[PDB]
RNA sequence: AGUAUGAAAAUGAUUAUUUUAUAAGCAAUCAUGAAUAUAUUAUAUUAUAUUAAUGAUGUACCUUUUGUAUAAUGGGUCAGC
RNA sequence: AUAAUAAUAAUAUGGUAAUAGAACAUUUAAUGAUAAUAUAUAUUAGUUAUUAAUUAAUAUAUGUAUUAAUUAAAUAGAGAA
C-alpha cells in the first residue's frame, strides 16, 4: 500500500560537500510542501541550498509530467549519502607530522508523495488507532502478576 | 498408446468411484480409517458413509469455469452422483445440533434471554467453530488437480477420503479474491462435513442406542468452554430490575451505600447494594456513586438471568424475558 | 433492555472426547546415501507394522527423495515437526519416532518458576477485596 | 460423619491435589504442566488422582491428608509429552579462555482435568 | 445456623501483614481433617456461583434455599440511599386525569421555553420524567436544541473530545458486568 | 592493478514500531505490565517477533601474577592474512 | 560369551599447567545415483539435548554437486602478538 501510492523519486548529481553539511539543511525540509521548500532553499545562505532547490524543481516538474499536481506534493523522505571515490591527499605539518585530507562528494535524494492520498490515508489510520485504544478505568482490571503457586490466597 | 486415452480411463474411473463409493475401495483409504476411529465412530458406520459425508453436492460445473482470467478455476472436483452426497445429511446434522444445544443450554440456564440464547447457541455450533472442529479432526480438502493426481498415479482411495467440492483454485493468488457463494467456500464445506458426521453417527445407532449421537455431541460440542457472563450488555438495568421486582413478589428495590474510601480522590471506591427489603439482590462497586449503582443493578439482573438449577431439581420454566 | 455480545466457544480437548494430537507421520528416506542406512533397515524391519497396529489413529507415509532422511509429524493444532535422522541406527530412528508421536504439536516454550497450571475458567472464590476482607487492616 | 452436602450443591468446584508432593490447584477442564516425563503413563491414558489434599467451594472447604478417595472423582488425561525450549549458557571463570556450555532442555507432561465432582 | 462447621480463613504461618503475598506460608499451613466454613473475601458483582445467588432468586423447590449461604451481613437500616429519586422515598402518586394531561401537552407545544419540564413538574406536583411520558415538544424546539448541542461539541479541542468518547466506553464497561 | 556478480561487516542519512524530558554506574540475565506487527485451523480468554514502564541480580576480555574492575600490559571498528 | 536401544540398584561427573578418549565446520584426492517438481548461497520463522544439520517462505545464480557415506591429506577453525 505504501509503494502503490503516488510518489516522485528525485536524485541529485555528484555535488561537492559533506554529508554533515547537507544534513543541516535537509533536516529543515522534512515534511514541508515542495512548493514552499523551494522558497526556503532559495533564501538559504548555504551553498548546498542552490542545488537542492534545483532538485526539488525537477521533481515538481517530474510529478507534473506523471500526472500529479505541484501543490499536492510534499517531501516525505529526504536524505543524503556518500557518492564514493573520495580523493585522499596528504597534509604536511611542521615537525615531520602528517595528516590525510579527504574531499567528500555526496548526493541528495528526495521522495515526494501526494498529500491527497498518502496524508489522508495516514490520518485515517491514526483515527482508527485512536478508536481502537482502550479506555482508562480508574478501578481497572489490572492483571494479578505473579504465579499463583498452588495456593488459594483468596 | 495415446496418453490422452489413459487419462480418459483414469478420469472415468475416478468419476465412477465417486458416483458409487464402493466399500471395497473406500476401506483401502488410510485417511478414512484413521479418521474413522480417531473419533471413535461406531463399528457399524461403514467407511463408504464416511466418504459420503466428505463428498459435496458438486453436480454441474458453473459458468465461471469458462475463463480463469476473471479469477476462478475449478479443476480439482469431478462431477458427483446426486444420490450419494452429504446434502441430506447436513440437514439432519443441523437439526440435531440445533436441538440439543438449545435444549442443553436452556436446561443449564433456564432464564436466559432469547437474544442471548441465540448468541450462545451460535457460539457452540457457529459456522466457524464447526469448520475449526473439522480441521482439528484432520479432514483434508482436495486441492490437487485431477490431472496432477494422474501423473503422480494416485489411487482413488486417497481422493475418496478427502473433502471434495468445487474449489476455487486461484482464490487468494496475487490478492485478487473473486467473491462467490457459500457453495464455493472451504469453511461451509468443512462445517457440513461435521454435521454430516453427526447425522451418520445417528442413523446407524438410532435403532439400538437412541442417546448415542447426543452423547457424541456432548463429548465434542458442549464440552467446549463458554462464559455466559460475557454475552450480556445491559442498557437500563435499574428500570428493568424494578420491573422484575414488581412482576415477582419481591419488594421495591432501593440502592444503598455500604462502604467508601477516597471519596475526594482520582479513583475512589464505593460499594452499593440493591436492597429488595432486608435482602440484597445485587452487589456493585465503582469509582463513582452512579457507576456503583449501575454495577449493582446489573449484578442482580445477571444473577436472575444466569441462575443454574441442580440436575436433581424439578424442571424450572422461566416466566419469560422481562419486558419494560 | 438486554443486548447480546457474540462470542465463540473454546476447544477443550480431553474434557469430553480426547482427540490424539498426532495425525500423520512421514518416513522419508533415500535409496542412495549412507545417511539413510538406519531408516532403510527400519522400513525393511517388522517394527513399522507394529507401530501401525499399536497406533492406528496415525497415518504413516514412506517416501523416496534424493536427500537426507526425515520424519514429518503433522498435529491437530496445525504445526509440523520435522526431524533430521542422518547417520542414525534403527533404534535411534525408532526413538525419534516415539518423541514425535507422544508430543503435542505446540511450539517449544520457556516457562517461569512454578508456572504449571493454565486455566481459562474463573475463580471459585473471588479476587481478594480490601473492603470485603477477613479482618480490617489495622 | 464427614458432611459434604454444601460441596454437593455447588455450580463450580476446585481441588488441590499433589503429584509427588507437588501441589496443583485445578478446576473443571484446567491444564496442568507436570515438570517431568511420566514413564508409567502413556499419552492418552486417563489418570485417577488419589492424593487430593483440599476440596472446596466459594465459601466452604474440605481438607484431608488425604481426603478419602470415595468422596470425590478427579480424573486427569495425558494430552502430550513435550520439552522446554532449548537454552544454553556459558559457564566460565574470570580470566579463563575455556568456556563450557550447560545445555538444558527440560521434560514436561501435559495433563488435562477431565472430571472433578463430589460423590 | 444450618451447618456447624468450624470457621477458618486463609492462613499463613508467617505474618500476613508483612507476608501476604508469600505463597510458601500457605503451602506450609496444615489444617486438621474435616469440614470448614471459610468465607470468601471477595465481591460478587459478576459471580454466577450458586453460593452468591439470592435466596429470593432461586426456585421454590431448591434445596439450597434452606441453606443460608448468601449471609445477610449488611443491614438495610443503616445503609443510606444512593442516587434515589423523590418518587422512591415517597410513594408513587396517580392524581392526574385526562383533563390535566391534555393541559400539559397543549401548554408545552404552545411555548416550550416558558413552559419547561421543571415548571410543569412544580405546577402539577409531578416528576419531570412524567412530562416526558405525556408531553412532546415542538419539532422546532428539538431541532434548535440539537443544533445548539452540535455547536457546543464543535468548540472542543482534541483532549476534551477524546475524554468524552473515553467516558462513553467506560459506561459500556459498567453495564457489561 | 584481469572480467562479471555482489541484501558481508564496519560507517552515514531518512523513515517505520516501541521506550524516553524527577533519574545515576560493563548497558546484559531473570521477573512483568503496555504498545505494535505477522499468523490460509486467533475456535480464543490465541502463539510468536520487536520495544530502556517497573522490580531483583550483575566489579569487560586476554596476558603476567600469591593476587586485578583494578588507576598493571594489549585492543577505534569491520574484512582478509 | 556379541552390537544397538530401553529398564532397576549403586558410585562418580568444579578445575589452571598437564594427561588421556571422542566428535563437528572448510579445502584437496580415490569411489560415488539423483536433478529447474533440483542444487548452491542469504534473510526470517520452526524441528532435532543444537560449534551442526534440517522444514517452510522469500531473493539471486546454475540444465547444475568432487553432492550421501568410507578412507588419505591439510596453507583445516582468530577479540587477542
Ligand atoms: Mg561502488
Ligand atoms: Mg602547517
Ligand atoms: Mg579523515
Ligand atoms: Mg588466574
Ligand atoms: Mg572467560
Ligand atoms: Mg519480611
Ligand atoms: Mg517521567
Ligand atoms: Mg548518567
Ligand atoms: Mg608483582
Ligand atoms: Mg576483585
Ligand atoms: Mg586497564
Ligand atoms: Mg577508568
Ligand atoms: Mg591501548
Ligand atoms: Mg571435569
Ligand atoms: Mg591457517
Ligand atoms: Mg578476523
Ligand atoms: Mg571466539
PDB file of N, CA and C in Angstrom, chain B residues 111 229 232-234 237 250 252 254-258 273 275 277-278 280-281 283-285 290-291 293-295 298-300 302-304 306-310 313-314 316, chain E residues 43-48 52-59 61-64 72 74-84 87-89 92 171-177:
ATOM      1  N   UNK B 111     -33.328 -19.234  32.560  1.00  0.00           N
ATOM      2  CA  UNK B 111     -33.852 -17.882  32.447  1.00  0.00           C
ATOM      3  C   UNK B 111     -33.103 -17.034  31.428  1.00  0.00           C
ATOM      4  N   UNK B 229     -21.566 -15.083  31.150  1.00  0.00           N
ATOM      5  CA  UNK B 229     -21.449 -13.753  31.732  1.00  0.00           C
ATOM      6  C   UNK B 229     -20.931 -12.738  30.721  1.00  0.00           C
ATOM      7  N   UNK B 232     -23.509 -10.614  27.830  1.00  0.00           N
ATOM      8  CA  UNK B 232     -24.542  -9.692  28.272  1.00  0.00           C
ATOM      9  C   UNK B 232     -24.109  -8.250  28.049  1.00  0.00           C
ATOM     10  N   UNK B 233     -25.086  -7.397  27.750  1.00  0.00           N
ATOM     11  CA  UNK B 233     -24.841  -5.963  27.601  1.00  0.00           C
ATOM     12  C   UNK B 233     -26.152  -5.246  27.905  1.00  0.00           C
ATOM     13  N   UNK B 234     -26.263  -4.710  29.112  1.00  0.00           N
ATOM     14  CA  UNK B 234     -27.472  -4.034  29.554  1.00  0.00           C
ATOM     15  C   UNK B 234     -27.469  -2.574  29.117  1.00  0.00           C
ATOM     16  N   UNK B 237     -30.418  -1.064  33.431  1.00  0.00           N
ATOM     17  CA  UNK B 237     -30.640  -2.140  34.407  1.00  0.00           C
ATOM     18  C   UNK B 237     -31.510  -1.736  35.581  1.00  0.00           C
ATOM     19  N   UNK B 250     -41.247  -9.871  44.933  1.00  0.00           N
ATOM     20  CA  UNK B 250     -40.202  -9.138  45.628  1.00  0.00           C
ATOM     21  C   UNK B 250     -40.588  -7.675  45.776  1.00  0.00           C
ATOM     22  N   UNK B 252     -40.032  -3.448  46.310  1.00  0.00           N
ATOM     23  CA  UNK B 252     -39.432  -2.403  45.501  1.00  0.00           C
ATOM     24  C   UNK B 252     -37.960  -2.235  45.865  1.00  0.00           C
ATOM     25  N   UNK B 254     -34.195  -0.631  46.398  1.00  0.00           N
ATOM     26  CA  UNK B 254     -33.520   0.624  46.696  1.00  0.00           C
ATOM     27  C   UNK B 254     -32.036   0.339  46.854  1.00  0.00           C
ATOM     28  N   UNK B 255     -31.208   1.185  46.248  1.00  0.00           N
ATOM     29  CA  UNK B 255     -29.762   1.024  46.283  1.00  0.00           C
ATOM     30  C   UNK B 255     -29.187   1.891  47.390  1.00  0.00           C
ATOM     31  N   UNK B 256     -28.368   1.286  48.245  1.00  0.00           N
ATOM     32  CA  UNK B 256     -27.834   1.950  49.420  1.00  0.00           C
ATOM     33  C   UNK B 256     -26.323   1.777  49.454  1.00  0.00           C
ATOM     34  N   UNK B 257     -25.666   2.628  50.235  1.00  0.00           N
ATOM     35  CA  UNK B 257     -24.214   2.638  50.324  1.00  0.00           C
ATOM     36  C   UNK B 257     -23.755   1.813  51.518  1.00  0.00           C
ATOM     37  N   UNK B 258     -22.719   1.005  51.304  1.00  0.00           N
ATOM     38  CA  UNK B 258     -22.169   0.127  52.326  1.00  0.00           C
ATOM     39  C   UNK B 258     -20.841   0.654  52.854  1.00  0.00           C
ATOM     40  N   UNK B 273     -25.394  -1.758  47.506  1.00  0.00           N
ATOM     41  CA  UNK B 273     -26.212  -2.956  47.435  1.00  0.00           C
ATOM     42  C   UNK B 273     -27.631  -2.578  47.040  1.00  0.00           C
ATOM     43  N   UNK B 275     -31.040  -3.281  47.694  1.00  0.00           N
ATOM     44  CA  UNK B 275     -31.814  -3.921  48.748  1.00  0.00           C
ATOM     45  C   UNK B 275     -33.262  -4.060  48.296  1.00  0.00           C
ATOM     46  N   UNK B 277     -35.754  -4.932  50.138  1.00  0.00           N
ATOM     47  CA  UNK B 277     -36.140  -5.124  51.519  1.00  0.00           C
ATOM     48  C   UNK B 277     -34.918  -5.272  52.399  1.00  0.00           C
ATOM     49  N   UNK B 278     -34.951  -6.222  53.333  1.00  0.00           N
ATOM     50  CA  UNK B 278     -33.749  -6.528  54.098  1.00  0.00           C
ATOM     51  C   UNK B 278     -32.751  -7.321  53.268  1.00  0.00           C
ATOM     52  N   UNK B 280     -30.478  -8.354  49.996  1.00  0.00           N
ATOM     53  CA  UNK B 280     -29.728  -7.655  48.963  1.00  0.00           C
ATOM     54  C   UNK B 280     -29.728  -8.496  47.698  1.00  0.00           C
ATOM     55  N   UNK B 281     -30.112  -7.878  46.584  1.00  0.00           N
ATOM     56  CA  UNK B 281     -30.222  -8.580  45.314  1.00  0.00           C
ATOM     57  C   UNK B 281     -28.940  -8.510  44.500  1.00  0.00           C
ATOM     58  N   UNK B 283     -24.705  -6.822  44.214  1.00  0.00           N
ATOM     59  CA  UNK B 283     -23.529  -6.178  44.777  1.00  0.00           C
ATOM     60  C   UNK B 283     -22.788  -5.458  43.663  1.00  0.00           C
ATOM     61  N   UNK B 284     -22.352  -4.232  43.940  1.00  0.00           N
ATOM     62  CA  UNK B 284     -21.687  -3.445  42.923  1.00  0.00           C
ATOM     63  C   UNK B 284     -20.671  -2.466  43.468  1.00  0.00           C
ATOM     64  N   UNK B 285     -19.567  -2.301  42.753  1.00  0.00           N
ATOM     65  CA  UNK B 285     -18.516  -1.362  43.108  1.00  0.00           C
ATOM     66  C   UNK B 285     -18.347  -0.346  41.986  1.00  0.00           C
ATOM     67  N   UNK B 290     -22.719   6.743  40.820  1.00  0.00           N
ATOM     68  CA  UNK B 290     -23.534   6.313  39.693  1.00  0.00           C
ATOM     69  C   UNK B 290     -23.020   5.003  39.112  1.00  0.00           C
ATOM     70  N   UNK B 291     -21.700   4.848  39.014  1.00  0.00           N
ATOM     71  CA  UNK B 291     -21.147   3.601  38.498  1.00  0.00           C
ATOM     72  C   UNK B 291     -21.501   2.431  39.403  1.00  0.00           C
ATOM     73  N   UNK B 293     -24.065   2.138  41.443  1.00  0.00           N
ATOM     74  CA  UNK B 293     -25.487   1.841  41.328  1.00  0.00           C
ATOM     75  C   UNK B 293     -25.773   1.043  40.063  1.00  0.00           C
ATOM     76  N   UNK B 294     -25.122   1.400  38.957  1.00  0.00           N
ATOM     77  CA  UNK B 294     -25.288   0.637  37.726  1.00  0.00           C
ATOM     78  C   UNK B 294     -24.741  -0.775  37.871  1.00  0.00           C
ATOM     79  N   UNK B 295     -23.563  -0.918  38.478  1.00  0.00           N
ATOM     80  CA  UNK B 295     -22.974  -2.243  38.638  1.00  0.00           C
ATOM     81  C   UNK B 295     -23.851  -3.129  39.510  1.00  0.00           C
ATOM     82  N   UNK B 298     -26.871  -4.280  37.509  1.00  0.00           N
ATOM     83  CA  UNK B 298     -26.505  -5.292  36.526  1.00  0.00           C
ATOM     84  C   UNK B 298     -26.259  -6.636  37.188  1.00  0.00           C
ATOM     85  N   UNK B 299     -25.600  -6.636  38.346  1.00  0.00           N
ATOM     86  CA  UNK B 299     -25.317  -7.893  39.028  1.00  0.00           C
ATOM     87  C   UNK B 299     -26.603  -8.619  39.396  1.00  0.00           C
ATOM     88  N   UNK B 300     -27.588  -7.891  39.927  1.00  0.00           N
ATOM     89  CA  UNK B 300     -28.847  -8.525  40.293  1.00  0.00           C
ATOM     90  C   UNK B 300     -29.538  -9.112  39.072  1.00  0.00           C
ATOM     91  N   UNK B 302     -28.078 -10.055  36.269  1.00  0.00           N
ATOM     92  CA  UNK B 302     -27.282 -11.173  35.779  1.00  0.00           C
ATOM     93  C   UNK B 302     -27.547 -12.423  36.602  1.00  0.00           C
ATOM     94  N   UNK B 303     -27.657 -12.263  37.918  1.00  0.00           N
ATOM     95  CA  UNK B 303     -27.907 -13.402  38.790  1.00  0.00           C
ATOM     96  C   UNK B 303     -29.250 -14.048  38.483  1.00  0.00           C
ATOM     97  N   UNK B 304     -30.280 -13.235  38.240  1.00  0.00           N
ATOM     98  CA  UNK B 304     -31.581 -13.783  37.871  1.00  0.00           C
ATOM     99  C   UNK B 304     -31.509 -14.532  36.549  1.00  0.00           C
ATOM    100  N   UNK B 306     -28.980 -15.825  34.905  1.00  0.00           N
ATOM    101  CA  UNK B 306     -27.989 -16.887  34.780  1.00  0.00           C
ATOM    102  C   UNK B 306     -28.114 -17.934  35.879  1.00  0.00           C
ATOM    103  N   UNK B 307     -29.259 -17.998  36.550  1.00  0.00           N
ATOM    104  CA  UNK B 307     -29.448 -18.991  37.597  1.00  0.00           C
ATOM    105  C   UNK B 307     -29.367 -20.394  37.009  1.00  0.00           C
ATOM    106  N   UNK B 308     -28.635 -21.272  37.692  1.00  0.00           N
ATOM    107  CA  UNK B 308     -28.392 -22.639  37.230  1.00  0.00           C
ATOM    108  C   UNK B 308     -28.951 -23.633  38.238  1.00  0.00           C
ATOM    109  N   UNK B 309     -30.121 -24.216  37.995  1.00  0.00           N
ATOM    110  CA  UNK B 309     -30.680 -25.167  38.957  1.00  0.00           C
ATOM    111  C   UNK B 309     -29.931 -26.489  38.938  1.00  0.00           C
ATOM    112  N   UNK B 310     -30.021 -27.202  40.058  1.00  0.00           N
ATOM    113  CA  UNK B 310     -29.378 -28.502  40.166  1.00  0.00           C
ATOM    114  C   UNK B 310     -30.067 -29.520  39.268  1.00  0.00           C
ATOM    115  N   UNK B 313     -33.220 -31.129  40.605  1.00  0.00           N
ATOM    116  CA  UNK B 313     -34.421 -30.334  40.799  1.00  0.00           C
ATOM    117  C   UNK B 313     -35.471 -30.682  39.750  1.00  0.00           C
ATOM    118  N   UNK B 314     -36.726 -30.423  40.094  1.00  0.00           N
ATOM    119  CA  UNK B 314     -37.781 -30.496  39.096  1.00  0.00           C
ATOM    120  C   UNK B 314     -37.545 -29.414  38.045  1.00  0.00           C
ATOM    121  N   UNK B 316     -37.501 -26.294  35.798  1.00  0.00           N
ATOM    122  CA  UNK B 316     -37.991 -24.950  36.073  1.00  0.00           C
ATOM    123  C   UNK B 316     -38.162 -24.226  34.748  1.00  0.00           C
TER     124      UNK B 316
ATOM    125  N   UNK E  43     -15.938  -9.739  46.337  1.00  0.00           N
ATOM    126  CA  UNK E  43     -17.232  -9.231  45.930  1.00  0.00           C
ATOM    127  C   UNK E  43     -17.808 -10.180  44.890  1.00  0.00           C
ATOM    128  N   UNK E  44     -19.110 -10.059  44.651  1.00  0.00           N
ATOM    129  CA  UNK E  44     -19.836 -10.954  43.758  1.00  0.00           C
ATOM    130  C   UNK E  44     -20.597 -10.161  42.707  1.00  0.00           C
ATOM    131  N   UNK E  45     -19.932  -9.182  42.094  1.00  0.00           N
ATOM    132  CA  UNK E  45     -20.608  -8.365  41.093  1.00  0.00           C
ATOM    133  C   UNK E  45     -20.898  -9.161  39.828  1.00  0.00           C
ATOM    134  N   UNK E  46     -19.952  -9.987  39.391  1.00  0.00           N
ATOM    135  CA  UNK E  46     -20.133 -10.760  38.179  1.00  0.00           C
ATOM    136  C   UNK E  46     -20.003 -12.246  38.415  1.00  0.00           C
ATOM    137  N   UNK E  47     -20.337 -12.690  39.621  1.00  0.00           N
ATOM    138  CA  UNK E  47     -20.216 -14.087  40.006  1.00  0.00           C
ATOM    139  C   UNK E  47     -21.568 -14.765  39.838  1.00  0.00           C
ATOM    140  N   UNK E  48     -21.607 -15.799  38.992  1.00  0.00           N
ATOM    141  CA  UNK E  48     -22.808 -16.605  38.819  1.00  0.00           C
ATOM    142  C   UNK E  48     -22.870 -17.745  39.825  1.00  0.00           C
ATOM    143  N   UNK E  52     -23.674 -17.368  45.720  1.00  0.00           N
ATOM    144  CA  UNK E  52     -23.924 -15.940  45.821  1.00  0.00           C
ATOM    145  C   UNK E  52     -25.269 -15.535  45.241  1.00  0.00           C
ATOM    146  N   UNK E  53     -26.037 -16.474  44.708  1.00  0.00           N
ATOM    147  CA  UNK E  53     -27.369 -16.160  44.185  1.00  0.00           C
ATOM    148  C   UNK E  53     -28.297 -15.854  45.358  1.00  0.00           C
ATOM    149  N   UNK E  54     -29.098 -14.791  45.308  1.00  0.00           N
ATOM    150  CA  UNK E  54     -30.005 -14.512  46.428  1.00  0.00           C
ATOM    151  C   UNK E  54     -31.033 -15.617  46.601  1.00  0.00           C
ATOM    152  N   UNK E  55     -31.477 -15.801  47.845  1.00  0.00           N
ATOM    153  CA  UNK E  55     -32.488 -16.817  48.112  1.00  0.00           C
ATOM    154  C   UNK E  55     -33.753 -16.551  47.309  1.00  0.00           C
ATOM    155  N   UNK E  56     -34.205 -15.297  47.273  1.00  0.00           N
ATOM    156  CA  UNK E  56     -35.450 -14.978  46.588  1.00  0.00           C
ATOM    157  C   UNK E  56     -35.366 -15.230  45.092  1.00  0.00           C
ATOM    158  N   UNK E  57     -34.164 -15.391  44.553  1.00  0.00           N
ATOM    159  CA  UNK E  57     -33.967 -15.527  43.119  1.00  0.00           C
ATOM    160  C   UNK E  57     -33.906 -16.974  42.653  1.00  0.00           C
ATOM    161  N   UNK E  58     -34.030 -17.945  43.554  1.00  0.00           N
ATOM    162  CA  UNK E  58     -33.978 -19.352  43.191  1.00  0.00           C
ATOM    163  C   UNK E  58     -35.360 -19.979  43.278  1.00  0.00           C
ATOM    164  N   UNK E  59     -35.510 -21.102  42.583  1.00  0.00           N
ATOM    165  CA  UNK E  59     -36.794 -21.774  42.513  1.00  0.00           C
ATOM    166  C   UNK E  59     -37.277 -22.147  43.909  1.00  0.00           C
ATOM    167  N   UNK E  61     -38.597 -24.973  44.859  1.00  0.00           N
ATOM    168  CA  UNK E  61     -38.153 -26.329  45.177  1.00  0.00           C
ATOM    169  C   UNK E  61     -36.647 -26.481  44.989  1.00  0.00           C
ATOM    170  N   UNK E  62     -35.882 -25.583  45.604  1.00  0.00           N
ATOM    171  CA  UNK E  62     -34.429 -25.614  45.536  1.00  0.00           C
ATOM    172  C   UNK E  62     -33.872 -26.014  46.891  1.00  0.00           C
ATOM    173  N   UNK E  63     -33.102 -27.098  47.001  1.00  0.00           N
ATOM    174  CA  UNK E  63     -32.563 -27.461  48.319  1.00  0.00           C
ATOM    175  C   UNK E  63     -31.709 -26.372  48.927  1.00  0.00           C
ATOM    176  N   UNK E  64     -30.988 -25.612  48.105  1.00  0.00           N
ATOM    177  CA  UNK E  64     -30.088 -24.588  48.615  1.00  0.00           C
ATOM    178  C   UNK E  64     -30.827 -23.392  49.194  1.00  0.00           C
ATOM    179  N   UNK E  72     -26.765 -12.528  55.110  1.00  0.00           N
ATOM    180  CA  UNK E  72     -27.177 -11.127  55.095  1.00  0.00           C
ATOM    181  C   UNK E  72     -26.322 -10.347  56.094  1.00  0.00           C
ATOM    182  N   UNK E  74     -24.996  -7.366  55.714  1.00  0.00           N
ATOM    183  CA  UNK E  74     -25.339  -5.952  55.758  1.00  0.00           C
ATOM    184  C   UNK E  74     -26.816  -5.769  56.075  1.00  0.00           C
ATOM    185  N   UNK E  75     -27.111  -4.778  56.913  1.00  0.00           N
ATOM    186  CA  UNK E  75     -28.470  -4.466  57.333  1.00  0.00           C
ATOM    187  C   UNK E  75     -28.927  -3.185  56.652  1.00  0.00           C
ATOM    188  N   UNK E  76     -30.156  -3.195  56.136  1.00  0.00           N
ATOM    189  CA  UNK E  76     -30.649  -2.053  55.378  1.00  0.00           C
ATOM    190  C   UNK E  76     -30.865  -0.830  56.256  1.00  0.00           C
ATOM    191  N   UNK E  77     -31.092  -1.027  57.554  1.00  0.00           N
ATOM    192  CA  UNK E  77     -31.484   0.086  58.411  1.00  0.00           C
ATOM    193  C   UNK E  77     -30.397   1.145  58.544  1.00  0.00           C
ATOM    194  N   UNK E  78     -29.152   0.831  58.183  1.00  0.00           N
ATOM    195  CA  UNK E  78     -28.041   1.750  58.390  1.00  0.00           C
ATOM    196  C   UNK E  78     -27.332   2.158  57.106  1.00  0.00           C
ATOM    197  N   UNK E  79     -27.707   1.604  55.959  1.00  0.00           N
ATOM    198  CA  UNK E  79     -27.089   1.987  54.698  1.00  0.00           C
ATOM    199  C   UNK E  79     -27.879   3.128  54.071  1.00  0.00           C
ATOM    200  N   UNK E  80     -27.289   4.306  53.875  1.00  0.00           N
ATOM    201  CA  UNK E  80     -28.045   5.417  53.294  1.00  0.00           C
ATOM    202  C   UNK E  80     -28.305   5.224  51.808  1.00  0.00           C
ATOM    203  N   UNK E  81     -29.351   5.896  51.335  1.00  0.00           N
ATOM    204  CA  UNK E  81     -29.759   5.789  49.942  1.00  0.00           C
ATOM    205  C   UNK E  81     -28.727   6.427  49.024  1.00  0.00           C
ATOM    206  N   UNK E  82     -28.606   5.873  47.821  1.00  0.00           N
ATOM    207  CA  UNK E  82     -27.642   6.331  46.828  1.00  0.00           C
ATOM    208  C   UNK E  82     -28.396   6.675  45.554  1.00  0.00           C
ATOM    209  N   UNK E  83     -28.286   7.928  45.124  1.00  0.00           N
ATOM    210  CA  UNK E  83     -28.875   8.409  43.878  1.00  0.00           C
ATOM    211  C   UNK E  83     -30.280   7.845  43.685  1.00  0.00           C
ATOM    212  N   UNK E  84     -31.134   8.139  44.656  1.00  0.00           N
ATOM    213  CA  UNK E  84     -32.509   7.658  44.668  1.00  0.00           C
ATOM    214  C   UNK E  84     -33.434   8.823  44.359  1.00  0.00           C
ATOM    215  N   UNK E  87     -39.726  10.041  43.844  1.00  0.00           N
ATOM    216  CA  UNK E  87     -40.832   9.099  43.762  1.00  0.00           C
ATOM    217  C   UNK E  87     -40.533   7.785  44.464  1.00  0.00           C
ATOM    218  N   UNK E  88     -39.276   7.530  44.819  1.00  0.00           N
ATOM    219  CA  UNK E  88     -38.908   6.298  45.501  1.00  0.00           C
ATOM    220  C   UNK E  88     -39.014   6.442  47.016  1.00  0.00           C
ATOM    221  N   UNK E  89     -38.449   7.513  47.574  1.00  0.00           N
ATOM    222  CA  UNK E  89     -38.553   7.735  49.014  1.00  0.00           C
ATOM    223  C   UNK E  89     -40.010   7.932  49.410  1.00  0.00           C
ATOM    224  N   UNK E  92     -45.210   6.445  44.847  1.00  0.00           N
ATOM    225  CA  UNK E  92     -45.731   6.981  43.601  1.00  0.00           C
ATOM    226  C   UNK E  92     -47.158   7.473  43.800  1.00  0.00           C
ATOM    227  N   UNK E 171     -18.890   3.646  30.240  1.00  0.00           N
ATOM    228  CA  UNK E 171     -20.275   3.286  30.530  1.00  0.00           C
ATOM    229  C   UNK E 171     -20.577   1.876  30.046  1.00  0.00           C
ATOM    230  N   UNK E 172     -20.151   1.549  28.827  1.00  0.00           N
ATOM    231  CA  UNK E 172     -20.380   0.206  28.311  1.00  0.00           C
ATOM    232  C   UNK E 172     -19.773  -0.838  29.233  1.00  0.00           C
ATOM    233  N   UNK E 173     -18.623  -0.525  29.825  1.00  0.00           N
ATOM    234  CA  UNK E 173     -17.948  -1.493  30.680  1.00  0.00           C
ATOM    235  C   UNK E 173     -18.702  -1.684  31.988  1.00  0.00           C
ATOM    236  N   UNK E 174     -19.318  -0.619  32.502  1.00  0.00           N
ATOM    237  CA  UNK E 174     -20.110  -0.738  33.721  1.00  0.00           C
ATOM    238  C   UNK E 174     -21.245  -1.729  33.523  1.00  0.00           C
ATOM    239  N   UNK E 175     -22.018  -1.539  32.457  1.00  0.00           N
ATOM    240  CA  UNK E 175     -23.211  -2.339  32.239  1.00  0.00           C
ATOM    241  C   UNK E 175     -22.867  -3.742  31.763  1.00  0.00           C
ATOM    242  N   UNK E 176     -21.712  -3.904  31.119  1.00  0.00           N
ATOM    243  CA  UNK E 176     -21.310  -5.219  30.635  1.00  0.00           C
ATOM    244  C   UNK E 176     -21.171  -6.207  31.783  1.00  0.00           C
ATOM    245  N   UNK E 177     -20.624  -5.760  32.908  1.00  0.00           N
ATOM    246  CA  UNK E 177     -20.522  -6.594  34.098  1.00  0.00           C
ATOM    247  C   UNK E 177     -19.764  -7.883  33.803  1.00  0.00           C
TER     248      UNK E 177
END
